[PDB]
Write an enzyme that holds these catalytic residues in place. Structure first.
Site, PDB file in Angstrom:
ATOM      1  N   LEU A  60      -1.361  10.945  13.880  1.00 46.08           N
ATOM      2  CA  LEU A  60      -1.004   9.573  14.372  1.00 46.08           C
ATOM      3  C   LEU A  60      -0.204   9.631  15.675  1.00 46.08           C
ATOM      4  O   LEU A  60       0.084   8.582  16.262  1.00 46.08           O
ATOM      5  CB  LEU A  60      -0.158   8.834  13.308  1.00 46.08           C
ATOM      6  N   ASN A  98      -0.915  -0.510  12.972  1.00 42.87           N
ATOM      7  CA  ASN A  98      -1.684  -1.250  13.972  1.00 42.87           C
ATOM      8  C   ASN A  98      -3.181  -1.235  13.678  1.00 42.87           C
ATOM      9  O   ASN A  98      -3.662  -0.488  12.796  1.00 42.87           O
ATOM     10  CB  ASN A  98      -1.340  -0.785  15.446  1.00 42.87           C
ATOM     11  N   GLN A 148       3.692   1.589   2.975  1.00 40.87           N
ATOM     12  CA  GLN A 148       3.493   0.601   4.095  1.00 40.87           C
ATOM     13  C   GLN A 148       3.905  -0.791   3.598  1.00 40.87           C
ATOM     14  O   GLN A 148       3.600  -1.156   2.423  1.00 40.87           O
ATOM     15  CB  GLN A 148       1.984   0.571   4.442  1.00 40.87           C
ATOM     16  N   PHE A 165       1.685  10.776   1.454  1.00 43.70           N
ATOM     17  CA  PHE A 165       1.271  10.168   2.723  1.00 43.70           C
ATOM     18  C   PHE A 165       2.309   9.166   3.266  1.00 43.70           C
ATOM     19  O   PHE A 165       3.094   9.538   4.155  1.00 43.70           O
ATOM     20  CB  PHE A 165      -0.168   9.578   2.602  1.00 43.70           C
ATOM     21  N   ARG A 187       0.861  -1.173   0.000  1.00 43.29           N
ATOM     22  CA  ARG A 187       0.000   0.000   0.000  1.00 43.29           C
ATOM     23  C   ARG A 187       0.903   1.230   0.000  1.00 43.29           C
ATOM     24  O   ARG A 187       1.625   1.480   0.997  1.00 43.29           O
ATOM     25  CB  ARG A 187      -0.908   0.038   1.266  1.00 43.29           C
ATOM     26  N   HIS A 216       0.372   5.625  17.010  1.00 46.63           N
ATOM     27  CA  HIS A 216       1.332   4.716  16.393  1.00 46.63           C
ATOM     28  C   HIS A 216       2.720   4.954  16.978  1.00 46.63           C
ATOM     29  O   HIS A 216       3.101   6.151  17.180  1.00 46.63           O
ATOM     30  CB  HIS A 216       1.347   4.874  14.861  1.00 46.63           C
ATOM     31  N   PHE A 266       5.212   1.585   8.497  1.00 46.21           N
ATOM     32  CA  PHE A 266       5.187   2.472   7.345  1.00 46.21           C
ATOM     33  C   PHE A 266       6.326   3.503   7.432  1.00 46.21           C
ATOM     34  O   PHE A 266       6.844   3.859   8.529  1.00 46.21           O
ATOM     35  CB  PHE A 266       3.827   3.209   7.229  1.00 46.21           C
TER      36      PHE A 266
HETATM   37  N1  LIG Z   1      -3.922   1.631  10.614  1.00 42.80           N
HETATM   38  C1  LIG Z   1      -2.633   1.628  10.221  1.00 42.80           C
HETATM   39  O1  LIG Z   1      -1.802   0.945  10.727  1.00 42.80           O
HETATM   40  C2  LIG Z   1      -2.169   2.581   9.133  1.00 42.80           C
HETATM   41  C3  LIG Z   1      -2.139   3.967   9.837  1.00 42.80           C
HETATM   42  C4  LIG Z   1      -1.828   5.082   8.810  1.00 42.80           C
HETATM   43  C5  LIG Z   1      -0.510   4.786   8.043  1.00 42.80           C
HETATM   44  C6  LIG Z   1      -0.562   3.354   7.422  1.00 42.80           C
HETATM   45  C7  LIG Z   1      -0.749   2.281   8.564  1.00 42.80           C
END
Ligand SMILES: NC(=O)C1CCCCC1
EC number: 5.2.1.8
Length: 165
Positions: A122, A102, A63, A60, A55, A126, A113
């Protein structure tokens, strides 16, 4: 002693592109840095070698790290399927930040990522654990194969990886 350095050799549809290296912040998040280090050398008998960036969203992030299901639903840490959020000392300050993917509190696995912009929303959600050292130009090259919905136009792989220095 010194924070570890790891590398990824990236390929595009099996054609070599170049090398990205990372400093891992073992001084601040030792448990999360160790996981990424050991996945990168493959010393526990599983890890990132041969996996893809499934992805990629320009402006942005890129990942990857899903070496069991190849699509963002899999992966595992060296401590078990999941481990806890270690701390949130470091923030998502801009391009080059390496952070854990996560699906909820205390669900870190192997997915991560690489930021290609500031992603401050985030922060505190994260765990940031490293930064690109050399090869941000290779990350920008990878990022041109992504799209708005994150589907890649060519297959972006970690052809090789391991620890430097
Ligand atoms: N939910 C995730 O882990 C995503 C959060 C935004 C960046 C890509 C990982």
């Amino acid at each position: 002693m010194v924070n570890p350095t790891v590398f990824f050799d990236i390929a595009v549809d099996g054609e070599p592109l170049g090398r990205v290296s990372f400093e891992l912040f073992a001084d601040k998040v030792p448990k999360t840095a160790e996981n990424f280090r050991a996945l990168s050398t493959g010393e526990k008998g599983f890890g990132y070698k041969g996996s893809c960036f499934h992805r990629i969203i320009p402006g942005f992030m890129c990942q990857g790290g899903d070496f069991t299901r190849h699509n963002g639903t899999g992966g595992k840490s060296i401590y078990g399927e999941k481990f806890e959020d270690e701390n949130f000392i470091l923030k998502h300050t801009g391009p080059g930040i390496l952070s854990m993917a996560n699906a909820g509190p205390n669900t870190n696995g192997s997915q991560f990522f690489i930021c290609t912009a500031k992603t401050e929303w985030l922060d505190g959600k994260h765990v940031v654990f490293g930064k690109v050292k050399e090869g941000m130009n290779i990350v920008e090259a990878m990022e041109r194969f992504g799209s708005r919905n994150g589907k890649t136009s060519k297959k972006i792989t970690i052809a090789d990886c391991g620890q430097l220095e």
